[PDB]
């Protein structure tokens, strides 16, 4: 049976992905980094086979609801019940969904309950005076009240305490599910909205579709803070603690992988569903992983191979930001949202393809436990077991050839067959000598000894 633990998510910012219809390019200026660039829903449909062939099983779209002027990213909503006209029509969205489901892919929409756009009509409506919290900045971030009540970046902060507001938000959450048959929501700005609302919200959306999937964006690096939202009806959480370590570690050579293993232990300790954590190297709110490599004056492709191998072999739900597969450069927002280029070399596309194939094929990578066998200054060995399958993941994030001998940590008398790069390690006198050249990786399955 397919569960969310088994999924791999491709993450698309609609306006910056693929312009499949030039006729809806109304305010487009591709030479203005703050304008619409013209990517749309037709462009997504056009690339569903591309996405599926890399092995992704689900797409998360940035919000598609009608935005005010300048809202190319979707987060400045003007009408919760309408598709943004740059992106297409409702009919186009239903067809995207249908086309995704025909290829056995799930669709998650980015969903906003915390705020409206700066210029939403409700702000000039006296009958909606009490739909918004008092207009003030958040200054004390350690006061969770203030975090929940204040206007984030000056965004009008909806007052969920008002039952009219709460009801409008529940109804529109249900409406999209009923109308379009989407598979889940990625919930924006979760920590800015009180926990009691999340419990009710989850009950409401699952009343329409019992298996509806919620993925919460809780922007924080302390997994104790993040984990609490798991207890209020949100199935899965975005793993910022993972990202903080993975982005750093993999964007330069000779750096220890051990912090990632501590992320995992802490995940098991704090979260009720520690495999339902969204893993990533970068996203729409971060400097591009490629750019971190470039800052380090080091080849981004080799960095990406190492980081992606970890992402696709460690616990959680990998989430790959569009463009990762082409080492798309970019600095801080908005430069980390460049239009996708489909006319590049295929080296990383093919690599991702193999990683997604292996994670599909090896249940230990989706469901196994996760042990650390060895880690030294960037040379790492991990082991994963599920029922009768044992895999070993070897990542040499060092600048030299490394030989690491296991002696006891695996059952004697077998061989490790390298499924990513064809390596072969045979038990010799009960020991396995794993040799990796600098900056390479391998994923082995343990299996019986073969021979000529
Ligand atoms: O105008 C503020 C800001 O809004 C958006 O930031 C998003 C961010 O992208 C999301 O992942 C999430 O945390 O919520 C924020 C607002 O809903 C835009 O993406 C950003 O460019 C813009 O500056
Ligand atoms: Ca367009
Ligand atoms: Ca608009
Ligand atoms: Ca709020
Ligand atoms: Ca060590």
CA distances from 140 to 136, 143, 145, 154 (A): 12, 6, 9, 15
Instruction: Please return the burial class of 282, using the count of CB atoms within 10 Å of its CB with bins 0-12, 13-18 and 19+.
Output: buried
Inter-residue contact 416 to 393 (CB < 8 Å) = no
| The CA-based dihedral angle spanning residues 175, 180, 185, 191, taken in that order and rounded to the nearest 10 degrees | -30
Lookup: tokens for 93: 């969205």
CA of 449 to the centre of ligand 2 (A): 56
**What are 287's two structure tokens?**
């400097």
What is the DSSP track for 71-128?
-TTS-SEEEEEEE-TTT--HHHHHHHHHHHHHTT-EEEEEE--SB--TT-GGGG-GGG
How many angstroms is it from 88 CA to the middle of ligand 2? Answer: 8
Q: Rounded CA gap, 214 and 106, in Å?
A: 13
The closest alpha carbon to 138, from 125, 128, 152, belongs to: 152
**Beta strands 58-61 and 106-111: pairing type?**
parallel
Burial of 219 (0-12, 13-18, 19+ CB in 10 A): middle
CA 432 – ligand 5 centroid, Å: 18
Residues at the binding site for Ca(2+) are: 19, 21, 24-25, 38, 40, 67, 84-85, 114, 148, 157, 192, 375
CA of 194 relative to ligand 4 center, distance in Å: 8
**Number of the ligand closest to the Cα of 156:** 4
Residues ≥6 apart with Cβ < 8 Å to 94: 179, 180, 181
Rounded (5°) CA angle 277-382-421: 100
Contacts of 124 (CB under 8 A, 6+ apart): none
Which of 317, 322, 226 lies closest to 269 in space, CA to CA? 226
Tokens of 366: 């989706």
Q: Residue for token digits 């393809």? A: 353
Tell me, in angstroms, the distance from the centre of ligand 3 to residue 55's CA: 33
Residue 153 CA, closest ligand 1 atom number? 2
Helix (H) or strand (E) holding 373: strand 371-376
Rounded to the nearest whole angstrom, what is the distance from the C-alpha of residue 350 to the centroid of ligand 2? 28
**Residue 341 has which token pair?**
């280029």
Contact by Cβ (8 Å): 36, 346: no
Alpha carbons 10 and 323: distance in angstroms, whole number: 10
Letter string b/e over residues 309-319, b meaning 16 or more CB atoms within 10 A of that residue's CB: bbbbbbbbbbb
Which-ligand-closest: CA of 46? Answer: 2
Q: Can you tell me the distance from the alpha carbon of 298 to that of 318, in angstroms, rounded to the nearest whole number?
A: 24
Say if residue 297 is exposed, middle or buried (CB neighbours under 10 Å; 0-12, 13-18, 19+): exposed
Left if phi > 0, otherwise alpha if psi is -120 to 50, otherwise beta: which for 124? alpha
Task: Determine the distance separating the centroid of ligand 1 and the alpha carbon of 299, expressed in angstroms.
Answer: 30
Ligand 1 binding pocket, CB closer than 6 Å: 73, 75, 112, 153, 188-189, 217, 219, 284-285, 333
Q: What sections of 298-379 are H helices per DSSP?
A: 300-313, 347-361, 363-367
User: Probe ligand 1: pick from 73, 155, 219, max atoms within 8 Å of CB?
Assistant: 73
Question: Is the Cβ–Cβ distance between 356 and 54 less than 8 Å?
Answer: yes
Residues with CB under 5 A from ligand 4 (ion): 114, 157, 192
- Ligand 1, from 285, 332, 338: best to mutate by most atoms within 8 Å of Cβ? 285
Identify the residue whose C-alpha is closest to ligand 1 atom 17: 75
**First vs last C-alpha separation in the chain:** 38
Closest residue to atom 6 of ligand 1, CA basis: 75
Which ligand 1 atom is nearest residue 283's CA?
A: 11
Check if the beta carbon of residue 86 is closer than 8 Å to that of residue 40: yes
Cβ neighbours of residue 269 closer than 8 Å, sequence gap 6 or more: none
C-alpha–C-alpha distance, residues 173 and 231, integer Å: 20
Please state, in angstroms and rounded to a whole number, the distance separating the CA atoms of residues 381 and 216.
Answer: 31
Q: How many CB atoms lie within 10 A of CB 408?
A: 9
Farthest-apart Cα atoms in the chain, separation: 83
> How far is the C-alpha of 258 from the C-alpha of 241, rounded, in Å?
13
The answer to whether 377 and 404 are in contact (CB under 8 A) is no
Tell me which residue of 372, 451, 358 sits closest to 406, measured CA to CA.
Answer: 372
Q: How far is the CA of 201 from the centre of ligand 3 (A)?
A: 27
C-alpha closest to that of 302 among 422, 395, 435: 395
Reduced to 3 states (helix: H, G, I; strand: E, B; else coil), residue 238 is strand
For 344, other C-beta atoms within 10 Å of its C-beta total 14
**Nearest ligand to the C-alpha atom of residue 30:** 2
C-alpha span between 148 and 152 (Å, rounded): 9
- Closest residue by CA, ligand 1 atom 1: 153
How many C-beta atoms lie closer than 10 Å to residue 242's C-beta? 26
User: How far apart are the CA of 241 and the centre of ligand 5, in A?
Assistant: 20
- Structure letter (DSSP) for residue 178: H
> Two tokens at 374?
């060895």
Residue numbers preceding breaks in the chain (C to N > 2.5 A): none
Other CB atoms within a 10 A radius of the CB of residue 391 amount to: 23
3-state class of 201 per DSSP? helix
Mutate to test the pocket of ligand 1, among 13, 33, 68, 75 (most ligand atoms within 8 A of CB): 75
**Sign of torsion over alpha carbons 178, 179, 182, 186:** negative
| Sheet arrangement for strand 414-418 | 371-376, 379-386, 389-396, 441-448, 414-418, 424-426
Tell me which residue has its CA closest to atom 7 in ligand 1: 75
This structure's resolution (Å) is 1.9
The Cα 127–Cα 60 span in angstroms is: 35
Closest ligand 1 atom to 114 CA: 17
Structure-block tokens of residue 215: 């993925």
Residues 6+ apart with CB under 8 A from 305: 348, 351, 439, 440, 441
Domains of the chain listed by start with CATH number = 1-363 (3.20.20.80), 364-452 (2.60.40.1180)
The answer to whether the beta carbons of residues 436 and 396 sit under 8 Å apart is yes
Measured between alpha carbons, how far is 259 from 147 in angstroms, rounded to an integer? 29
- On whether the CB atoms of residues 390 and 417 are closer than 8 A, the answer is no
Residue with CA nearest ligand 1 atom 4: 75
Cβ atoms of 384 and 390 within 8 Å: the answer is yes
């Amino acid at each position: 049976e397919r569960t969310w633990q088994d999924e791999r998510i491709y993450f698309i910012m609609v306006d910056r992905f693929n312009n499949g219809n030039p006729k809806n390019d109304y305010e487009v200026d591709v030479h203005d980094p703050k304008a619409y660039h013209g990517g749309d829903l037709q462009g997504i449909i056009d690339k569903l086979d591309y996405i599926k062939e890399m092995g992704f099983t689900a797409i998360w779209l940035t919000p598609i609801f009608a935005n005010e002027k300048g809202g190319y990213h979707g987060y400045w909503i003007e009408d919760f019940y309408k598709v943004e006209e740059h992106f297409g029509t409702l009919d186009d969205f239903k067809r995207l969904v249908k086309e995704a489901h025909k290829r056995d892919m799930k669709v998650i929409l980015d969903f906003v309950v915390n705020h409206t756009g700066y210029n939403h009509p409700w702000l000039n409506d006296p009958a909606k005076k009490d739909w918004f919290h008092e207009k003030k900045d958040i200054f004390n971030w350690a006061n969770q009240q203030e975090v929940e009540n204040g206007w984030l970046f000056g965004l009008p902060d909806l007052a969920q305490e008002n039952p009219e507001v709460k009801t409008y938000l529940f109804d529109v959450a249900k409406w999209w599910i009923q109308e379009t048959d989407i598979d889940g929501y990625r919930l924006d700005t979760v920590k800015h909205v009180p926990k009691w609302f999340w419990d009710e919200f989850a009950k409401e959306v699952k009343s329409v579709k019992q298996d509806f999937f919620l993925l919460g964006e809780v922007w924080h690096d302390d997994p104790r803070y993040v984990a609490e939202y798991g207890k209020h009806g949100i199935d899965a959480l975005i793993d910022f603690p993972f990202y903080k370590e993975a982005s750093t570690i993999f964007s330069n050579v000779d750096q220890s992988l051990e912090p990632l293993y501590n992320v995992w232990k802490r995940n098991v300790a704090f979260y009720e569903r520690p495999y339902l954590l969204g893993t990533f190297l970068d996203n729409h709110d971060t400097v591009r992983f490629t750019r971190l490599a470039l800052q380090n004056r080091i080849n981004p492709v080799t960095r990406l191979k190492l980081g992606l191998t970890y992402l696709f072999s460690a616990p959680g739900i990998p989430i790959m930001y569009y463009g990762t597969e082409i080492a798309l450069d970019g600095g801080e927002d908005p430069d980390n949202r460049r239009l996708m280029n489909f006319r590049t070399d295929k080296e990383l596309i093919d690599y991702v393809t193999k990683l997604g194939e292996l994670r599909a094929k090896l249940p230990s990578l989706r469901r196994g436990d996760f042990e650390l066998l060895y880690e030294k200054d960037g040379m790492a060995l991990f082991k994963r077991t599920y029922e009768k399958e044992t895999t070993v993941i070897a990542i040499n994030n060092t600048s030299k050839t490394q030989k690491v001998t296991l002696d006891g940590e695996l059952e004697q008398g077998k061989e490790l067959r390298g499924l990513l790069a064809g390596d072969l390690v045979r038990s010799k006198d009960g020991k396995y000598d794993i040799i990796l050249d600098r900056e390479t990786a391998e994923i082995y399955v343990l299996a019986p000894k073969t021979g000529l």
